[PDB]
Design a protein around this ligand. Structure first.
Ligand SMILES: CCCCCCCC/C=C/CCCCCCCC(=O)O[C@@H](COC(=O)CCCCCCCCCCCCCCC)COP(=O)([O-])OCC[N+](C)(C)C
Ligand SMILES: CCCCCCCC/C=C\CCCCCCCC(=O)O[C@@H](COC(=O)CCCCCCCCCCCCCCC)COP(=O)([O-])OCC[N+](C)(C)C
Ligand SMILES: CCCCCCCC/C=C\CCCCCCCC(=O)O[C@@H](COC(=O)CCCCCCCCCCCCCCC)COP(=O)([O-])OCC[N+](C)(C)C
Ligand SMILES: CCCCCCCC/C=C\CCCCCCCC(=O)O[C@@H](COC(=O)CCCCCCCCCCCCCCC)COP(=O)([O-])OCC[N+](C)(C)C
Ligand SMILES: CCCCCCCC/C=C\CCCCCCCC(=O)O[C@@H](COC(=O)CCCCCCCCCCCCCCC)COP(=O)([O-])OCC[N+](C)(C)C
Ligand SMILES: CCCCCCCC/C=C\CCCCCCCC(=O)O[C@@H](COC(=O)CCCCCCCCCCCCCCC)COP(=O)([O-])OCC[N+](C)(C)C
Ligand SMILES: CCCCCCCC/C=C\CCCCCCCC(=O)O[C@@H](COC(=O)CCCCCCCCCCCCCCC)COP(=O)([O-])OCC[N+](C)(C)C
Ligand SMILES: COc1cc(CNC(=O)CCCC/C=C\C(C)C)ccc1O
Ligand code: NA
Lengths: 474, 119, 140
């Protein structure tokens, strides 16, 4: 068409994840492939390209069509003469057991528009980013390459980032408290290692910056709503800003290096919270924090600040100088101290008209207790029914980004990342040639169904040195 | 009561080693932040004494003024207020998570655990 | 076999507490006993011993096969000539009431590998330690 979308590119697009569509589209998506096989048995319809580059599967994952994405991956065409199109093949099936070979051709980080590269890095405007990665292969696909050659590299980064901050902290707590900030290295074992602490801190702080620049106005070019969705990579970028802010002041002879450094620190330890993208039961707990500070704080604080700035202002007007808690600041602070658990109720006797001065504070405490309560009630009645599922689902995504960004840290080698499947043959083309295809294995069992399903690839069951193919309509 | 003991046995093995690692970070972070800032001139300059103060916000005794030996007030307050907030965020999810994760079924499980733990 | 597990020791093991298995295994576990009664009426198949020592019931409770553990305890074979195998017998039944006699031979702390000695002291790796002890006799 004018956009270049074919029949199949449309069937993906027209769906909207409802039942009738999903029941429908998968069927029509089945037939046309069977026909395109029977009519012209060379056209690889699932490998054609629209003007934006996306293959149908790529479009499906991109726009977020879960039902279609299920079918395209875990299809199974029993019909002979058109078996090459299938993906979920079944190798050895010793009775109740059956081992399957979910194909991988366009869903591993080797092709341009791999789904897993699309699903994770795409906008939050794509509905069901999460539920796509709960399809059968992609889910187990990640946890394995977590359990090999990522969990090691990840924990290694966790080690180094700790060693960064222990040094950074160490530079700080032993910072020179003297005159202006160039500080003119004096000779002592401490100060040789002090300046070492400075340099490693800066030289590492700039690393987050550059890797942050690589994220923002480079690969994954994000927009404003996408900055806040991608919450973490701001914070590690924001850390480097204060840090690279601090170093300027340190050489600009201005004392304010300490301020910038401190904010950078506090995020930095708070940033170590980020590397619980491993460690499932804690990763769930970090993601919650990410989902009040974007969804359930900018509401609440605007409310609580009003009462505060209101009832504080109320008190300040009343009280007349004659200690000297007359400033708006000092007063606003007191009414914050009721909240945490230190409330004077008597913090000045410089008031005229007691009864006014008490009714407000008591009316502030009350409404505050009303207001801290609904922050609890609303979160329950709004989402407690389902966060443990969603938050878990968010974690599996938020691990998935880490996996992919880690694979890219390996330039193109992939040598221990072609994601087992080792070009297992699974049949023959519909002209006679072999059909070697990458295939992640999955073992299963069904006790009701007994897996007499046609499509066995290997007569002798199993997986060892020595494979022997079946009369799969040779 | 046996049901109520078993709960305690099931946060101190499942729901503490998570949480404290989180809360200690904020503490050791925002505490360290303050210590660096404050300059000697009482003498709450040690990391220990400072880390302890930020524990005292949690229980219900928060000075907010525990030293005027600071340079740069506005930094010294934004942290503490940012510590109190995130701590309130963080003590809350310790409540939310336990509900939405298991309140649906502990009274059954915990009861079932008791009958074993009696057995 | 090489491990010493018989037919019955396998049927226990192969299950995984799902419905179809549990519906299945209890049935095949029923018949072979009825046959082993009718064919050779001395073989106490439920009292044979694998190399690890565990009887089938012991294996069931050990590995934590709740559905099987239900059946093995509260079975009831109405069929004559093979009633000795049953456990949940019914004594006096005055109309709506009926008093039952859940057998105890291998589930009290007198034998070596009593289930109740196994269920409690076993690892937490055995799923459903808890739900086994909610079967009818063991609970009461
Ligand atoms: C200077 C150095 C600094 C340290 C840097 C560390 C460097 C390297 C780090 C190394 C850590 C792990 C090494 C590998 C060990 C096991 C291998 C394995 O099986 O993989 C497992 C890893 O293991 C875990 O998941 C253990 C649980 C850790 C809980 C979080 C830390 C506790 C903080 C407490 C602090 C509170 C103190 C007291 C508070 C009062 C993963 O398998 P799993 O099935 O996913 O495990 C489930 C467990 N889970 C649900 C918890 C996730
Ligand atoms: C000797 C003592 C401290 C030395 C500290 C010197 C600076 C080290 C960099 C700090 C660091 O840990 O970053 C990386 C070091 O990854 C490496 O291994 C390369 C080191 C450069 C590891 O962290 P990361 O996983 O690469 O960064 C998170 C990625 N994110 C920013 C996109 C979320
Ligand atoms: C989204 C926000 C982050 C965006 C990116 C940020 C980019 C980072 C880029 C450069 C560094 C920017 C900060 C330091 C430079 C200002 C220095 C300063 O004047 O400090 C002031 C407070 O400064 C603040 O209030 C900072 C507020 C940030 C807190 C974060 C909010 C959460 C305090 O100074 P003072 O009270 O006037 O000192 C008087 C004492 N004297 C007389 C001895 C001098
Ligand atoms: C969750 C966070 C909770 C805690 C957050 C902390 C609470 C936020 C705190 C302070 C809010 C910051 C804005 C107000 C500035 C206050 C500073 C001040 O001293 O008053 C100023 C404005 O005082 C006013 O004009 C009243 C406020 C007008 C409403 C605009 C808001 C005027 O200064 P002055 O005192 O009148 O000086 C005497 C004047 N003279 C010397 C010129 C004669
Ligand atoms: C959303 C919900 C919003 C509702 C929020 C409000 C709900 C809660 C409201 C609670 C109100 C309770 C406070 C009562 C006032 C203080 C009384 C007092 O201290 O006595 C003082 C005088 O005080 C007066 O003279 C006040 C005169 C009566 C006004 C009270 C109206 C209350 C109605 C409001 C309805 C004297 O102070 P003293 O230290 O006792 O000195 C004793 C010495 N002497 C007596 C010898 C002089
Ligand atoms: C839930 C529980 C919450 C509450 C738990 C309690 C919080 C945990 C508390 C303390 C944590 C224990 C470890 C730090 C030791 C602190 C002791 C200390 O005084 O500082 C030491 C290390 O100071 C540092 O190096 C800063 C920490 C570096 C990061 C490594 C952690 C150095 O001592 P100093 O003060 O600098 O002495 C002056 C040095 N001079 C005499 C040699 C010249
Ligand atoms: C996850 C959520 C994270 C967000 C957490 C943060 C959210 C909450 C943040 C709340 C911030 C509120 C604190 C305001 C700073 C203190 C004001 C103050 O005390 O005045 C002091 C000067 O202070 C300055 O000079 C500061 C200059 C302006 C910096 C404020 C930036 C706030 C932006 C941040 C955004 C003077 O002290 P004083 O005792 O009043 O002396 C009065 C005498 N005199 C005026 C005559 C000299
Ligand atoms: C990156 O990892 C994560 C980090 C966080 C914590 N968020 C923050 O960094 C904000 C709080 C830090 C204090 C802010 C104020 C300064 C100026 C003192 C939540 C979830 C995550 O996944
Ligand atoms: Na309190």
């Amino acid at each position: 068409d004018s956009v270049g979308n074919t029949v199949l590119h449309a069937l993906v697009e027209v769906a909207d994840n409802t039942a009738d569509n999903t029941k429908f589209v998968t069927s029509m998506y089945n037939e046309i492939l069977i026909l395109g096989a029977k009519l012209h048995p060379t056209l690889k319809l699932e490998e054609l390209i629209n003007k934006k580059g996306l293959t149908p599967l790529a479009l499906a994952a991109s726009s977020g069509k879960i039902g279609v994405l299920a079918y395209i991956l875990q299809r199974e065409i029993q019909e002979p003469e058109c078996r090459h199109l299938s993906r979920k093949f079944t190798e050895w099936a010793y009775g109740p057991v059956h081992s399957s070979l979910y194909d991988l051709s366009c869903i591993d980080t080797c092709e341009k528009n791999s789904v897993l590269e699309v699903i994770a890095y795409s906008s939050s405007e794509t509905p069901n980013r999460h539920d796509m990665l709960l399809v059968e292969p992609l889910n187990r696909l990640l946890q394995d390459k977590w359990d090999r050659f990522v969990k090691r590299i990840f924990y290694f980064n966790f080690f180094v980032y700790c060693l960064y901050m222990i040094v950074f902290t160490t530079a700080a707590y032993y910072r020179p408290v003297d005159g202006l900030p160039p500080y003119k290295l004096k000779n002592t074992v401490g100060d040789y290692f002090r300046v070492t602490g400075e340099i490693l801190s800066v030289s590492g702080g700039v690393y987050f910056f550059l890797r942050g620049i690589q994220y923002f106005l480079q690969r994954r070019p994000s927009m404003k709503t996408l900055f806040v969705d991608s919450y973490s990579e701001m914070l590690f970028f924001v850390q480097s800003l204060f840090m690279l802010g601090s170093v300027v002041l340190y050489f600009s002879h201005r004392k304010e290096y300490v301020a910038s450094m401190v904010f950078s620190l506090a995020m930095g330890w708070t940033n170590m919270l980020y590397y619980t993208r491993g460690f499932q039961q804690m990763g769930i707990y970090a993601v919650m924090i990410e989902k009040m500070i974007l969804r359930d704080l900018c509401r609440f604080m605007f409310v609580y600040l009003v009462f505060l700035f209101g009832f504080s202002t109320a008190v300040v007007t009343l009280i007349e100088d004659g200690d000297s808690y007359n400033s708006l600041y000092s007063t606003c602070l007191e009414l914050f101290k009721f909240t945490i658990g230190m409330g004077d109720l008597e913090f000045t006797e410089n008031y005229d008209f007691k009864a006014v001065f008490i009714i407000l504070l008591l009316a502030y405490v009350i409404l505050t207790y009303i207001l801290l309560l609904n922050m609890l009630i609303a979160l329950m009645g709004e989402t407690v029914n389902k966060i443990a599922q969603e938050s878990k689902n968010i974690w599996k995504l938020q691990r998935a980004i880490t996996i992919l960004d880690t694979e890219k840290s390996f330039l193109k080698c992939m040598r221990k990342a072609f994601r087992s499947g080792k070009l297992l043959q699974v049949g023959y083309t519909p002209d006679g040639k072999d059909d070697y295809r990458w295939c992640f294995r999955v073992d299963e069992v069904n006790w009701t169904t007994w897996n007499t399903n046609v499509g066995i690839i290997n007569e002798d069951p199993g997986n060892c040195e020595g494979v022997k193919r079946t009369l799969s309509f040779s």
